[PDB]
């Protein structure tokens, strides 16, 4: 492992993937885990992983990758809450397709059900907290500073009408201090993990003035980031209901470099590495616009050094979100506009391999 900088170590970063609607698939109550303790990666359509997806995006100069893994239904009971090793292990298959390309690899917690940012369920959380990063900090002892571990995706009071407008005390409160309780976890566990570079979010990993002012970050950990996911602007990129827009327009812009720079003041300016670790836009039939947008948001957090990892959900067509970048099932980019336009905005030469015809 190097003793690197978390903020040296992002220089490395192109651009980034995430494995979208797969190890974070949650189908706990339609499947039987108990029976099939993997099962849960394709119950969202999504086809089984394989190193092939991988290199099609590595040959896109893709070059961190984010496995969003929700645990939940896959681990024991009190006391150990012990991972059940079937799923451990295909999760380490799963990081080993990047990783082993010499690419980054981020590994979380996603969708779980007991770590929301609620006081009646705090002591618990932590508890659970501390010994679910154990065991995944033990697993991937060994593994160099590409391995880097994140350790909530959007903690929030889900199903309340803060869980999206950025909080409140309790919700700042039990984000903070589980954030703390996975850095302390993994700081203390063995082999390069006292090295590992390390992400927590503030409160629903919001790109918002409520989550930012209340974020408590770490002093004295050069190896720390922090995590925001931000699909700005929300009206073009995530809306499905009555506001949405399918052109990038100019409040559309503005929306967005306000946004960037709430991250930029929060962050950058204040020497916090950040990372955007989700974002996206829908397809809307508009991969013109989408192009313009992906372009204009790249250059501008490449400006500011902030890498980002495009939010891939396997979703192409319907009514829900359609975030498909990559045909996983025929390896071909969907959106080649929308790779070069990546490409472009982070300063490389653009080539776009794999395109669908
Ligand atoms: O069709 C398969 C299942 O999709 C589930 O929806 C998922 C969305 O498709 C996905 O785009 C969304 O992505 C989240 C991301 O997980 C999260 O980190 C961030 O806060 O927001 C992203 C964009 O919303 O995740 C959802 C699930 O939360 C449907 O819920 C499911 O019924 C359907 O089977």
Request: glycine letters at 8%; charged letters at 25%.
């Amino acid at each position: 492992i190097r003793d690197i900088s978390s903020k040296e170590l992002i220089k490395e970063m192109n651009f980034g993937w995430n494995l979208g609607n797969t190890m974070d698939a949650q189908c706990i109550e339609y499947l039987n885990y108990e029976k099939d303790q993997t099962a849960s990666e394709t119950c969202w359509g999504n086809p089984k992983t394989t190193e092939d997806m991988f290199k099609v995006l590595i040959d896109n100069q893709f070059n961190v990758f984010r496995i969003p893994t929700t645990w939940s239904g896959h681990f024991g009971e009190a006391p150990d809450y012990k991972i059940d090793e079937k799923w451990l292990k295909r999760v380490h298959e799963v990081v080993d397709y990047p990783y082993k390309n010499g690419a980054f690899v981020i590994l979380n917690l996603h969708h779980e059900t007991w770590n929301h940012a609620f006081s009646e369920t705090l002591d618990t959380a932590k508890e659970i907290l501390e010994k679910i990063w154990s065991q995944i900090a033990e697993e991937f002892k060994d593994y160099d500073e590409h391995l880097i571990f994140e350790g909530l995706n959007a903690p929030r009071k889900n199903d309340t009408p803060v869980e999206w407008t950025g909080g409140d005390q309790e919700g700042w409160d039990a984000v903070n201090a589980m954030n703390a309780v996975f850095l302390k976890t993994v700081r203390s566990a063995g082999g390069n993990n006292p090295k590992r570079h390390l992400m927590i979010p503030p409160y629903a990993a919001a790109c918002n003035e409520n989550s930012f002012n209340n974020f408590i970050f770490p002093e004295d950990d050069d190896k720390v980031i922090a995590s925001v996911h931000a699909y700005a602007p929300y009206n073009f990129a995530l809306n499905n209901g009555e506001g949405a827009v399918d052109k990038f327009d100019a409040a559309g812009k503005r929306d967005l470099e306000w946004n960037i720079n709430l991250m930029k003041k929060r962050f950058v300016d204040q020497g916090i590495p950040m990372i955007l670790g989700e974002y996206g836009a829908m397809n809307r039939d508009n991969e013109e616009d989408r192009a313009t947008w992906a372009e204009f948001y790249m250059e501008k957090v490449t400006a500011m050094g902030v890498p980002q990892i495009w939010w891939d959900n396997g979703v192409f067509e319907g009514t829900g979100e359609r975030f498909g970048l990559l045909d996983r099932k025929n390896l071909k980019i969907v959106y080649p506009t929308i790779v070069a336009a990546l490409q472009k905005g982070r300063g490389l030469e653009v080539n776009v391999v794999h395109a669908i015809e």
